[PDB]
Amino acid sequence: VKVTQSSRYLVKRTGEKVFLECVQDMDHENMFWYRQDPGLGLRLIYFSYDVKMKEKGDIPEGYSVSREKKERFSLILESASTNQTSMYLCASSQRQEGDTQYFGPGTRLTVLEDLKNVFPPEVAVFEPSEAEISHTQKATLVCLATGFYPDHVELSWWVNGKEVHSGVCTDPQPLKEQPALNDSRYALSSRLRVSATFWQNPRNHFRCQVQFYGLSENDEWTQDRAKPVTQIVSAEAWGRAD
Amino acid sequence: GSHSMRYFYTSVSRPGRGEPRFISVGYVDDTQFVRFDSDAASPREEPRAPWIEQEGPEYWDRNTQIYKAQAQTDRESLRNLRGYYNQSEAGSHTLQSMYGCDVGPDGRLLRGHDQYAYDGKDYIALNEDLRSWTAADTAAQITQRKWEAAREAEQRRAYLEGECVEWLRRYLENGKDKLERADPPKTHVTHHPISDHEATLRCWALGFYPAEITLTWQTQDTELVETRPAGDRTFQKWAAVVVPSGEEQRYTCHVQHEGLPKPLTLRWE
Amino acid sequence: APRGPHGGAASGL
Amino acid sequence: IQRTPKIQVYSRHPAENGKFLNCYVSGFHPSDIEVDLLKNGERIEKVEHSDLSFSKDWSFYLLYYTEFTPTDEYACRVNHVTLSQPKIVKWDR
Amino acid sequence: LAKTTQPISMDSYEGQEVNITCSHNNIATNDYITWYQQFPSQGPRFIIQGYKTKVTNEVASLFIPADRKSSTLSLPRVSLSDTAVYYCLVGEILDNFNKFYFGSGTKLNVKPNIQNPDPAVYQLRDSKSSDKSVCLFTDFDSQTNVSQSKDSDVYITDKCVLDMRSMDFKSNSAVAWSNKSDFACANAFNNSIIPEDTFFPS
C-alpha cells in the first residue's frame, strides 16, 4: 500500500510547465490523477490502465500525463493557470479490481499570476489567562500564524524541545484577513492546553512552530522584502509563576 | 419453465497475422440475442434479436468495452496455455469459453456454468457447487491452483448468482411472447427402398422450439442426425433405421418434446 | 449482459 | 484436436414451387471453414451465414443460408483442414 | 456526472452509531457499490464494497436494499478520529472503461460529549510586548455555534476540539483577536449566541 508523490507543496507562476510525480511499488496496472476542490469532491483528470496507455478523465484540459513505466504516472500542467490551483491526488489499482484504489498523500499546488503577494507567516504565542488558571486549574496557550500567503502552512507545538499532540487543537482551516479581497492573506490559530501547575513552572519551554511552504531557489525575486522561501517561523514562551 | 442465459466465447490465435480473433455470442435458451467480433470493421456488440434492441446506448457501449477487455484477458490466457503445453510459438490455437446461469420458474438460480476448452478438449470447469474446479489434465491443474489461491470461484459464483440471474430476468420479461413459447414438432415417416430386400425408414421432426428433443427407432442400427436450425427461430431433426422389406410394421418411431401433450408413437403409414 | 471484472473478465488462465 | 465437419443441406420450409436454402456445418474443429452454396454447380454469390458458435460438446457450428425458390440442382461445397479435397453434398429428400 | 447522491455533511456525537444513506436510483445491473473514507489532510481510503448482500468488516457495515436504489453505510459508535469525508461510489471499471466517479461525499463531523460545560471567555496577552491581544472562548458544549465577527478588523476562528488525553478531558474553544485598541473580550463574541451562564472574569 505504498503510493508516493514527489511534491507536497508547490507555488508556481502562471505560464510555467509544472511536473507532478506519482509512483507506486505495487505493480498495479491502473494509475489515476484527480484534483479535489472545495465542494466539488475529487474529479478525474487522467487515468492510465497500463504502461503507455492514457485515458482522458472528466477534466483533462490544460494537463498532460506520462506513463512510460508501470511504476510511475506523471502529471504535467503544460502552461499553468490560476484555476489549476488545487489539491492533486494520485491513486493506483489492480486491473482485476480497478475500483479498489490506493491513494498517495497529495500535492497542494498554488498557481499565481505573480509571486509578489507571497508572504511567510508572522508567528506569536499568547500566554494563559490568570483567570482561566484559577477557574479551571488548566492553562491554554494560543498560537497565531498571521499574514501568510498562499495557504501552505503546518503548525506544531513543541514542549521542552519535543513535539506534542496531546492537548492540541489547530484550526482545520485558516481565515482570510481580508474577506472582501480575492487577494487575501491568511491567519491560523492553535491552542495548547496544559495543567496550570505545568505552565506555572518556569523551567518549562513552549514553542509554536509554523512550517511555511513558499518559493524555492529558481524562483526569481526582485522586491525589497526578503525572498519568501519555504521556511520555519517560530514563537515561544517560558512557564511563569506570575 | 426453466430458463438459461449463456455466453459463448471463442479466441483464436494467428501468430504473425496480428492479434487473436475474439468472437462472442450470447443466448437466452435457444435464442441468440447478441454478437461481438473483434475483426469487424467497427467492433461493437450488436443485437441479434428484436427484444434486446430496447437497450439504450449505455448498454451497448459498456458491453463492447467489456468484450474488448475480455479479448485481452483471453490473449494472456492463450500465451499461458501455449507454455503449459510446451507448444510452438508458430501454431494457431483455440480457447473456447462458456458461462451462464440456469433458473427455474421460481426465478432463482438453479445451476451455474463456467467452463473452458483448449484446442477442442475440456480444460477446466467450475463444479456445480460453484466453489471448486475440475481440471481435465495436468496443464489445467496449474490454472486450478492459481484460481484456488486467488479465490476465483467466488467472483465467478458472484456473477452467476447475481448479475446473470438479474439480466436473465430482464430479457425474459422483454422478449416475453417469444422466449417462453413452445412450438411442437410437425412429424412424418418416410420410406425408401435400398434393395429388393430392404429400405430406409426415416422419422422426421420439424418446426419445433426449443431444440431439445428425443427421437428413437424401436440403436445399434439407428442413424441419428444432429438437430439443425431452420433459419426461422426453429429446429429440425430426423432418425433412420435400415429395415427389411415387408417388415416395416415391427418398427416404431418415438418422439419426445416439451411443446407437445402426447409423446408421439409413429409407424410408417 | 456479459460478466465484467467483478465476475471474472480480467481473470486469466 | 481435429474433427471433420458434419454437413447437412436442407430447406427451411417445405420444398413447394414458389417462394431460404440452408447448409448446416457442425461438429468441426478447428473453426476455420469454407462453405459455398451451389446452384447448378455454380457458386451462389449472396449467401449469409450465422455467427460462429459452438455446442456444449465444444463442437463449432455455422449456418449458411441464401433464399430458395425451387424447380436445377443444389449443393454445398465445404472445405476444412480435415478434408483432402472439398466435400460436396447434394440437397433434397 | 454524479450517479450517487448523499448529504453534503452531517454531525454526530462521539459514542453514537452513524448511518449514511446514499442514493443511486439509476444504478446499473453490473455496478458495484463502493465506499471510501478520507481523513483530513489524507487521500481517501477504500473501506467497504458490496453488490447486494449485506457486508460487514471492522470499519463499517454496508446495507443494500432489494432494489439497490440506495445503500447505507453504518459506522459503529464513532470516535472523534472518525471525522472524515465519506464517499459513496457506484460503478464499473476495467481497462479503458471507467464509470467510477467519486462525487463530493458526506463530511462527517463528530462532536465531543462535554461532561460538565463551564463556558468562559478569557483574555491572553502576547509573550512579547503588545502587537495583538487574544480572547479565548472555551469549555462550552458542542452545540455552540461560533459566528464570525461583524467587524472588519476582528478575526474569529471556528470552534476546535482539544483532547487532553492524560486527564481524559476534552474541551472546545474558539479564538478571537484584533489589533484595534478598542477590542475587549467582553464583547468579542457578540455576533455569536453564547450561554447566559458564560463566565466573564474582571
Residue numbers in the entry:
A (entry chain B): 2 to 243
B (entry chain H): 1 to 218, 225 to 275
C (entry chain P): 1 to 13
D (entry chain M): 1 to 19, 22 to 73, 76 to 97
E (entry chain A): 3 to 204
Authors' text:
Human leukocyte antigen (HLA)-I molecules are of central importance in the presentation of antigenic peptides, enabling CD8+ T cells to eliminate cancerous and virally infected cells. However, HLA-I molecules can present extended peptides (>10 amino acids), whereby the N- and C-termini are similarly constrained within the HLA-I molecule, forcing the central region of the peptide to bulge from the Ag-binding cleft. NY-ESO-1 is an immunogenic cancer-testis antigen that is spontaneously expressed on a range of melanomas and other cancers including myelomas. To identify the principles underpinning extended peptide recognition, here we investigated TCR binding of an immunodominant NY-ESO-1 13-amino-acid peptide (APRGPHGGAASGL) derived from positions 60–72 of the cancer-testis antigen, NY-ESO-1.
Conversely the KFJ5-TCR adopted an alternate recognition mode, whereby the bulged peptide was flattened upon TCR ligation. In comparison to the KFJ37 TCR ternary complex, the KFJ5 TCR was shifted by ~2.5 Å towards the α1-helix, resulting in the Vα chain docking more centrally above the peptide-binding groove and the Vβ chain positioning more peripherally. The total BSA of the KFJ5 TCR-NY-ESO-160–72–HLA-B*07:02 interface was notably smaller at 1560 Å2. In the KFJ5 TCR ternary complex, contact to the HLA-I surface was facilitated via an extension of the F-strand of the KFJ5 Vα domain over the N-terminal extremity of the α1-helix. Here the CDR3α loop is distended through the incorporation of four additional amino acids whereby the non-germline residues served to cap the peptide-binding groove of the HLA-I along with the germline Asn112α (CDR3α), which formed a hydrogen bond with Gln65 of the α1-helix. In stark contrast, the NY-ESO-160–72 peptide underwent dramatic remodelling upon recognition by the KFJ5 TCR, due in part to the steric occlusion from the distended CDR3α loop and the coordination of the CDR3β loop. Here, the super-bulged NY-ESO-160–72 topology was deformed upon KFJ5 TCR ligation and adopted a ‘helical’ peptide conformation (P5-P8), the impact of which resulted in a relatively flattened epitope upon KFJ5 TCR engagement, which in turn resulted in a markedly reduced (~20%) contribution to the interaction surface. Peptide recognition in the KFJ5 TCR ternary complex was almost entirely modulated via van der Waals interactions, notwithstanding the solitary hydrogen bond to the peptide from Asp113β of the CDR3β to P6-His, which flipped 180° into an upright conformation, compared to the KFJ37 TCR complex, while retaining contacts with Tyr33α of the CDR1α. Superimposition of the two-peptide conformations revealed an r.m.s.d. value of 3.6 Å over the 81 atoms of the peptide, representing a considerable remodelling.
